[PDB]
Amino acid sequence: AVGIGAVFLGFLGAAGSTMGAASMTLTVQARNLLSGTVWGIKQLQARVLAVERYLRDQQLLGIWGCSGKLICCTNVPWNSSWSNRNLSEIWDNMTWLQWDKEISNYTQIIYGLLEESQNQQEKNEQDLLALD
Amino acid sequence: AVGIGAVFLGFLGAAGSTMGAASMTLTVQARNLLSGTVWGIKQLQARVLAVERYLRDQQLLGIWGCSGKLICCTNVPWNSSWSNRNLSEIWDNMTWLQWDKEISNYTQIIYGLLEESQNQQEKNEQDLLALD
């Protein structure tokens, strides 16, 4: 009751920090994603844009192997044509906005690799379940 | 023959029945929750209220350990300050509206307990997965 617990900022709090300081709390930006006669359609087209951009990322998240785990390993290797950076730097030197600039060409190649690497593991799980 | 209309009830069919017969069929209340120029905007503002109140309970469900499993055990204990009743009744004496009157003060403390009991299990599961 003395109130001694630790608090870790709030929305977009670690948005400039390094990866080693950004991955402790990702959930705070996660939970503020659904709740929070002509000016009702500015309410309507803000609501069906909010629920639309929530469902598109929850669907691209949903169709990989990661239902709601929010951080998950996968099986695809890291081709050095994507980033060519050292591993020991890019988790404590840089920050996320330089990464999103540093990789934005190579997205939609990674998402197709992730979907095929999930569906191949999916049918191989089915082929495992089929033999027994 | 096989197949009769006696025990195959409908929407809100067991709404007066006991907990042991209402938890038998929860899907019937589940499926009638989403489907079923100025009187079209009363359709629009009814639709985006239906899909909004579906996503809010599916989000409060989502952030616990129960993604879409619809019946799930958890790890938090049952503090007897809430109900203090014996178990052998609460599957055959009351009905659901009698439970909901009997507990309605104690919601939103329990809902705060489940999120912390999930997210503690989430990062402790992650710390278990990181070392191996």
Partner: antibody, heavy 122, light 106 residues
């Protein structure tokens, strides 16, 4: 992982001064409230000092028996906790533990304990 | 100050039996109660936080209960590794105080 390693313990004459250190790793140091708690040779546990974390308000707390004598401090840039002791008494003799608290409302508990450093005042 | 009274002070039990340890507060600490085990030559380790919620890594045989001033730690099949000194702790008010501990012997 979370590491807390205390140093600086020793044999001190009464009336003397001694600075303890606690080196922490594995967490965002400044955000957590940290404490020193001591365990007496008869094994009793006595809270000694607390300094709140950066998002906790950063204040210090002491029991009356040590106020004006004991000082808890932190150097967040180096992830180190300090305990400054002055006007030491023979009753201060104990193993001193560095401890890290939990998170949020249910985080006033001690979450991590150090190995301890021994202070003997005689 | 809140006085925490742990009972019994010392207790010898055979491995496999179950025990109930009492902690009584001089004022209400309704959910402010944590349990720690300190085995010989070791630092204390948190077992149970805020009366009853279990902690990852603590065995399921450890259970807590109680509300207000009266709290109980159940150990429902005691193992050899469980023997040691047991402390309760309150965070309801300054200064922080401990119970005297139950020492569990084999």
């Amino acid at each position: 992982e979370v590491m807390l390693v205390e140093s600086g313990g020793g044999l001190v004459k009464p009336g003397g001064s001694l600075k303890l250190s606690c080196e922490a790793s594995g967490f965002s140091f400044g955000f957590y409230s940290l404490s020193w708690v001591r365990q007496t040779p008869e094994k009793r546990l006595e809270w000694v000092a607390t300094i709140a974390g950066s998002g906790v308000g950063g204040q210090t707390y002491y029991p009356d028996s040590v106020k004006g004598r004991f000082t808890i401090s932190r150097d967040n840039a180096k992830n180190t906790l300090y305990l400054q002791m002055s006007s030491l008494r023979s009753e201060d003799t104990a193993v001193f533990y560095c401890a890290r608290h939990g998170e949020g409302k249910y985080g006033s508990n001690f979450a991590y304990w150090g190995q301890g450093t021994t202070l003997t005042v005689s | 100050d809140v006085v925490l009274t742990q009972s019994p002070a010392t207790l010898s039990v055979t491995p496999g039996d179950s025990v109930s340890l009492s902690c009584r507060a001089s004022q209400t600490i309704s959910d402010n109660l944590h349990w720690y085990l300190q085995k010989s030559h070791e630092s204390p380790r948190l077992l149970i936080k805020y009366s009853s919620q279990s902690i990852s890594g603590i065995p399921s045989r450890f259970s807590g209960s109680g509300s207000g001033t009266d709290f109980t730690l159940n150990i429902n099949s005691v193992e050899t590794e469980d023997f040691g000194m047991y402390f309760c702790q309150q965070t309801n008010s300054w200064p922080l105080t401990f119970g005297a501990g139950t020492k569990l012997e084999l």
